[PDB]
Design a protein around this ligand. Structure first.
Ligand SMILES: [Cl-]
Ligand SMILES: [Cl-]
Lengths: 233, 242, 240
């Protein structure tokens, strides 16, 4: 019955969202638990790669709209943590989204906060909060243009339209498409593969790819150079 | 036969370029009129989404090469407005390009300045000014890479080659492809769809998506959080529905 | 037998990497020769576009792993030049990658440093250094996300996987795919096409497309406006 649970298999930690009646929507306490799970993952020396997976046939419907306006609603912190929980956490290690069913609104934002996205053939991603007038305040306006280009990003943001798996893959919004029911396993396999590689190197390259955004090239290249030292140590 | 005219249909404002002899090329006075049309749109509280449409079977051929070297030539302002007119204006509300025929040179730049692009199946986009030796000075060198990625932007910019609708859609250069004759209508329908959503929320998300470019992620996320206060009145007005 | 040579045909300069026993891997001395070749190109007023081509059926396998840990290894300079040689050089004129065989590790970074990439249909690109535990330190972490978007870049970087030509084209990692053995010719043809346009204007647009990254839009636009002055002489030359 816990909204969030964590299962580990060697160096891959799977963080699991489970709110069957709420289509894995995330309220205040669920957000805090998601944040706690990723903070533990980040600090855990034995954990190399995480997987974020929604249980029971869907990924995440976004913020819990029933709970908004109540004591259980998402917390609104100007400098973070983000309303969905970990959406402003800059992890030292990668996370793979394992998406079944719907990843919409705050749920697409959690997907986008992950480093890679594995989706099932019938899954749907979208900015559905467009319909409701609830703004993207879990990084969607920053990550969508950077992940897939401003043009496509503006399409998804302005229209709020659904994006199915084949289009999602074609435009780079997701990285793998697998059969129905297979997302968790495919993501965990991918995570295990990334975890088998030399880890300080994975982390130096990842951290640089993320940090370079918004930097002038010379400055970005000076930072990238620091990876040598990271992997010597 | 005014070069620029404006037609409104509820909350959608259509800005129409019409210079049949010049294939909708934009000289100085036309640029000023385009700028004024969009300035008016920006200030009109009843107007939610604009459509930029070229009349008589084409979008825009670029800056008017025939007006070059005359007092009808495009104006060159170091800090704006841009030569094509509205190309350095940051509108508070979105614009959709409705592209028939050609969107080339300064004309592809107008298309890129819009938020979304709907093109007809036989239309052609391109940095044709490459052949002419006329530089991109209406944001093309900035918006092409950010819109479709640096690699494809370099292809289009270096070669100046034509891009047909098929390829344009595949690479994200355009967002919708429709049948010949249908761009204005399809763009207007898409515009009405966007205008039917809660608008302060639309504008908050759009403004952040535009502004985050070049910012460090933390500062960008701090700015994005501002959207809560932007929609506060509108969320309350809609509290019943919600 | 020289590791690097240079051949010119009119305004197109082809820089050729040839280390057939080492799969065109780049050690310290080869890197220095690649840098010198591109430095010469950059200063050559008659050279308009460069082509980077690997001889003998492959492009470049990255840093020479056998030279690594010796005094022939790549040099490590905090502020440049880059270990592969020219990878931190911001050239005043464009370069086209002509890829056969493999462009991996440092080799994919040289490909990404070029402006355009023409690849052979059986060619393979990849971040193979992921397996080796050697970091991307020739701009791959910067150029990959900017070139094809953050999502696809993270795929390639984290997994280190091989990307074939068809996928490469589809995702914008390469710009043209041609038949086996034809990358050099196809790149030289494309280079000559680009060389035939007015060049000050090409260079103004290119420099602005590069410089704008990281800049706020407004500052980027102010910089872009400078292209008018850059082309002033050329515009008059072409006036009538
Ligand atoms: Cl895009
Ligand atoms: Cl991408």
């Amino acid at each position: 019955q816990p909204a969030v649970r964590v299962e580990k298999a060697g160096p891959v930690t799977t963080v699991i969202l489970n709110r069957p009646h709420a289509r894995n929507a995330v309220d205040g306490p669920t957000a805090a638990a998601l944040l706690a799970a990723f903070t533990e993952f980040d600090a855990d020396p034995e954990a190399s790669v995480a997987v974020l997976w929604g249980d029971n046939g869907t990924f995440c419907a976004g913020a819990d709209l029933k709970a908004m306006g109540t004591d259980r609603g998402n917390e609104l912190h100007p400098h973070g943590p983000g309303p969905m929980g970990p959406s402003r956490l800059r992890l030292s290690k990668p996370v793979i989204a394992a998406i079944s069913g719907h990843a919409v609104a705050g749920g697409i934002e959690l997907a986008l906060w992950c480093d890679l996205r594995v989706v099932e053939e019938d899954a749907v991603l979208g900015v559905f909060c467009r319909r409701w007038g609830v703004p993207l305040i879990d990084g969607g306006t920053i990550r969508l243009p950077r992940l897939i280009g401003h043009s496509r990003a503006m399409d998804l943001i302005l229209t709020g339209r659904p994006v199915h798996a084949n289009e999602a893959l074609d435009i780079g919004l997701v990285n793998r498409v697998v059969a129905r029911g297979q997302a968790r396993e495919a993501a965990e396999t991918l995570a295990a593969e990334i975890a088998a590689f030399p880890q300080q190197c994975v982390r130096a390259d990842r951290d640089s790819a993320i940090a370079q955004w918004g930097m002038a090239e010379e400055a970005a290249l000076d930072n990238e150079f620091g990876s040598i030292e990271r992997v010597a140590t």
